[PDB]
Write a protein that binds this ligand. Structure first.
Ligand code: LJ8
Ligand code: LJ8
Ligand code: LJ8
Ligand code: LJ8
Ligand code: ZN
Ligand code: ZN
Ligand code: ZN
Ligand code: ZN
Ligand code: ZN
Ligand code: ZN
Ligand code: ZN
Ligand code: ZN
Lengths: 396, 395, 396, 398
């Protein structure tokens, strides 16, 4: 019955690939995914479903098929402010300065494909499936937005909840699982350094925030290089910097965009507090009078996969796909806001990874301007995973 | 004669200040000053003159008044990409992100008021006066543009050529002169650091150009702090930096905006070549594969004022304004493209400064978001100075 | 039965063994120049009726034969560190020496000599061969390699198994810690010489100032760990010493950096060291320095890997003898060791474990602080007992 | 220029061999500031050889008064400390490189010039009239040596002269010539040791440490912004970190790093500004690293900018130009170096000039002071230094 529903996907592959390409060409910023959200709703309605608009642009649909267990599956849909440079025939317009550089369009299309399979083959399963389409995953607070907009009150809990993510992974087109800690705790901040501007030839009459900002970025390197146990995992990335316009003037303000990662909450707070200590001291070293501003954007805890359920899924994937197609890996250094969803329902959860590339780990990585999951396999594998994962509950 | 042309200015003071406030509210980028250039030409025509469009947006008007000596005077008109924060009634709209933070609007209105006073009093003077309204002074190459658009061919060389610049100087509302080296040699560059982007959590799969750019900015300080004779004058300013968008991604490119100063041409070249050496080595340190790019914007040699002509003017200004009102100062650390103008004509030249503020050097400096020369005196004193400098040739 | 009796035999010699430890504590010597320490070790072996063989400059090996049966080797190192002792112990090394046993190598040595004394005084209680290996120059001195290169494996018949241990500030208090497989990190140690051009402090423009360059290098080296290494890996770059110049008003010619690296494996170890070279060269080039920097190799070691079956066997043995509480498995440490050159020369399986020397466990001062002072009697007794407990499955 | 002047100068040929041997002796006995035992003892002996009575003032300093008839009084100062620099000249009279000491600033030459001049004066008392005071000063290289002499009662022990001079050898143009600056000649300086106190540990466990080597590196780098950003480009400022020391084993993280720091500034206000900026930076860098212990600032020495008496400088320039030739004595802009010398004439309350002379055929292309190659060339470097003293004194004494 699992094999039958998977085989039924071949009929719709050409339509599903065109839908993926459409999403690829409509990349939108966190919590502003209006065309994307509207299309997801339309696709769900096309299947006779009643998508519930939760968390501004979020969409949740319940596929009812009699008595039985209930499985939820989550897929996010926001893109990134990166100019597409893939040369794909279906590339987003480079003019947009936006790109699905993390595969969220693929996650979305995978989920819509699985929903379609389930809706069109109710003879092959029993129970309930909940499709959860989440906005704003790229530090936008999207999972929290859905939870705060009454997700757990509006939608009855499932028995289990799953999600997945595409990346440049080995084995090519295979699946990767981690029981227990899978990802890292993260935060995202903007840091505003306020100096005193002036003429480029009279620096002694200024407090030069560009020199201070440079000194800060350099000193921040010492958090990971000297302050964190070498056996732990920690990252401080400064992903953006902006200040000044004219070459011959010293500006007033420099803004830094900062991202942190750590193995656990305590160490995540440690890293963030070290950042604040350094930024304050660097301003003091320069004699800057205005306190630097720390603007919080988002934070997430480390994703922890239910141990028993991860093992159950690995056994199921190995059975269906072959032993070497589903492999256990150590935790990734990435992060995710996904668990806010299963935790609001109070249900166990597993998130896994899959490979979108024949070159596996040699392919360009997520958040490069070249990230381009390979059709047809990347889409077929993500779509099939959802069905395979659901089967022990819905076809058993 | 001079006191008579100076006194005639009160009758137009109201209109001249309205004009200044107009330019103040239309700040435009170097070489792109379409509205201010248009209004400069309109104002010249209002007086019956025939302004010639030279160097994209530049405007030169010749005021012919019988045989006699010829005097050119230059005023620049470009503004800066700074958001105005003066609080003035006539402030440029803050959402423009533009401001006359160097007083170029004042220079222009002082020259338009002086042209008007000369046109309305042709019996009180004798010879020729050239008004040169120059675009793109702020590293735009404006003076060179005018020269390369045939300024020396289209306009007959005067006997002398002058210019002034307002700043926050002592004595309040007075004048300052420097014979010989007055300013520094300068250059302006954009430098592009090309790394390899990726995910914020996987820096090992990237070549992070923000960390490299930070390293460069810090290393560049050693040019002035270790490589230049402590007795010399050198400056390396990084006035802008831009790269990345999302906080959780590592970008591909960072652009630095860089400005140099030096007391002389050889030192100016030494500084620029040191910047290149440092940028190249910092990229190599990170294992960056792409060469960094050096994008030349502009350069000027140090301004040198004719020593005899400077002394002559100092004497003239002290006689008319008062002994204490026109003083000699040591060279400033700033720069100017002005001398390409007189040098194309092959004429002796002086540029001086005047104070636009009651607080003098305690007032906000040029290129701050608060730089606002004080009416009426700031415009009054710059307008008068032009006539007073012109006198020994025309009166 | 016989294990307990041999351990119990230690009680009567406790006073003498503590004074011997204090003697070593007060004679800390530099790596490969442990003249007095080596002489005393030989004298202590001779007073037990043994024939110490001088191998590896200052190294001493004694073979204790006691009839037919298996052979066990045990290694203890004996070099100290150039750290001024600051413990306030009544048996402190003279602070004027500027030398201290800040790593407990005196304790390792005394533990081994005590266990040897037990074995020779109780030959009725065991059978087979015990090999005491006293190794110099472990602190980056290449001591293990000196012993091997001076014919250890040709002069001394291979044992069946080879062991070693190290004291540190560990939990549980006075307990033992084990790690099967990778236990430590690959390391290297270098001196790096930066050659500038000196001059008068007031005329920097006539110099190439190697202090400012050295400062630049130390800062830039932080980006190896902070940016160039996988966050999930283990890597360290420590600059442990710096020296250049004498007069405040002069710009010197040379600055020397003492540098130490750690990495989880050989490939990453080589990466880190190559990255150091690339940074040092570029920073000298950034300053316009003409003379090439010099890289002076001191020592390197691969990651210690404990034999997996043997570690399990020892874990089970220690838990049985001391209590389940008192011997625990721990994740790998970030430190390193040259020990394995010894068993790999003989071609025998090996385990190295740790023991706690402190009531406060991990809250006590750590190795290489100027306060590191393992607590008598427990620290010595537990180290001495471990050797006997580990050898017992073979000798008893 | 005079006939008696030329005669006294000519007399130097008779003593040149012994004077050069003496210079070579001093060169081979370089000693640390305020610890110049053998050099002080030899200076005293050389003055005693000439029948003079040297007075030991300021620990190792020596002053001799030569009175010879009625007339004005001229004092001349020469310093005698060396530097902790390993000599690398390859001179046959090099100091032993194992000593780790060298006269890298020419103070041995200054000293021998002064002793040679004193000898010429003592041997030719028929050619002059008045008083000459030889002032041999220790500890000039930030040792507080001029201060030590003043504090040990120089001005109460030795009657004031009418004028007081000093000179310094360097790699200057014209070759073997003289350079003068009326008014401000040098820069205000200070010298400090700065002690950074972290928390040590094992090299592989940096998270249990506060690493002072990383902090010291960040300090040295950040200190560059004082000159590069905080000081008016038209001014003169220097911040040099001349020494750094911390740690011993490569695989440990140490507890302390010491920085040796030197400042220069055109005036007293700016000098204080720079020093206070150093303290702000050091304190903030330690706080950035979360270091609990306060860093320590250990004051060594400071001097104001040397200012030469304007009229006296013009008098000396005219005198040297007459005697040596116009192109041999030139006016130069202020140098960026410093000197403690003026504490001496200021204690006596008398006008003063210090000038410079060139010790090298290659002039400014020769090795600079405080290089390990600094080697003033005999005979000319010594001859020209000795002559200058006699030429300078001549308007008063001849
Ligand atoms: C799950 C992981 C896939 C890519 C990756 C693979 C291996 C190691 C690092 C990252 C990251 C997914 P992401 O969508 O980009 C989540 C974003 C934002 C997470 C957050 N809200 O903090 C991130 O910065 O990590
Ligand atoms: C002349 C000087 C007045 C402001 C000032 C006064 C004292 C010290 C520094 C600057 C600066 C005039 P400016 O319009 O700002 C010239 C601009 C551009 C000059 C150039 N084209 O390189 C500059 O960067 O220096
Ligand atoms: C085994 C470990 C105990 C101390 C420690 C404990 C936990 C984490 C790090 C170090 C260190 C032993 P060590 O004598 O200090 C080895 C030395 C020298 C090793 C070498 N030859 O590279 C080192 O630098 O690591
Ligand atoms: C007078 C000058 C000669 C060398 C020089 C020449 C040109 C430019 C700078 C220095 C330096 C004499 P010095 O003996 O080296 C004085 C020392 C010490 C002065 C002090 N006590 O602060 C210094 O650091 O400046
Ligand atoms: Zn992403
Ligand atoms: Zn994603
Ligand atoms: Zn300007
Ligand atoms: Zn301007
Ligand atoms: Zn150790
Ligand atoms: Zn050890
Ligand atoms: Zn010196
Ligand atoms: Zn000197």
């Amino acid at each position: 019955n699992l094999q039958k529903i998977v085989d039924s996907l071949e009929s719709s592959r050409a339509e599903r690939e065109e839908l993926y390409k459409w999403f690829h060409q409509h990349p939108e910023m966190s919590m502003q995914e209006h065309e994307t959200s509207k299309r997801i709703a339309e696709e769900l309605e096309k299947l006779g479903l009643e998508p519930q608009n939760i968390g501004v642009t979020g969409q949740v649909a319940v596929i009812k098929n009699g008595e039985g267990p209930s499985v939820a599956f989550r897929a996010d849909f926001d893109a990134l402010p990166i100019t597409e440079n893939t040369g794909l025939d279906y590339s987003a317009d480079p003019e947009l300065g936006m790109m699905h550089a993390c595969g969220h369009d693929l996650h979305t299309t995978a989920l819509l494909g699985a929903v379609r399979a389930l809706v069109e083959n109710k003879d092959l399963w029993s129970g309930t499936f909940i499709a959860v389409h989440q906005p704003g995953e790229e530090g936008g607070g999207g999972a929290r937005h859905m939870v705060d907009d009454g997700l757990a009150e509006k939608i009855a809990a499932p028995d289990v909840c799953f999600a997945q993510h595409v990346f440049n992974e080995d084995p090519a087109f295979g699946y990767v699982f981690t029981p227990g800690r899978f990802l890292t705790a993260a935060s995202n901040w903007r840091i505003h350094i306020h100096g005193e501007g002036g003429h480029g030839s009279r620096p002694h009459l200024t407090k030069d925030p560009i020199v201070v900002a440079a000194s800060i970025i350099t000193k921040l390197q010492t958090i990971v290089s000297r302050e964190v146990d070498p056996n732990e995992v920690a990252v401080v990335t400064v992903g953006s910097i902006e200040g000044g316009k004219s070459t011959n003037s010293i500006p007033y303000t420099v803004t830094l965009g900062v991202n942190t990662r750590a193995s656990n909450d305590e160490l995540s707070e440690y890293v963030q507090n070290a950042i604040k200590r350094i930024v304050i001291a660097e301003c003091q070293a320069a004699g800057i009078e205005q306190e630097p501003e720390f603007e919080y954007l988002d934070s997430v805890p480390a994703v922890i996969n239910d141990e028993d359920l991860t093992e159950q899924l690995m056994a199921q994937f190995r059975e269906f796909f072959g032993e070497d197609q589903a492999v256990e890996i150590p935790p990734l250094s990435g992060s995710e806001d996904y668990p806010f969803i299963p935790n609001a329902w109070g249900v166990p959860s597993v998130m896994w990874g899959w490979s979108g590339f024949a070159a596996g780990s040699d392919a360009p990585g997520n958040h490069t301007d070249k990230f381009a999951p390979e059709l047809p396999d990347a889409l077929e594998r993500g779509t099939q995973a959802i069905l395979v994962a659901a089967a022990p509950w819905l076809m058993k």
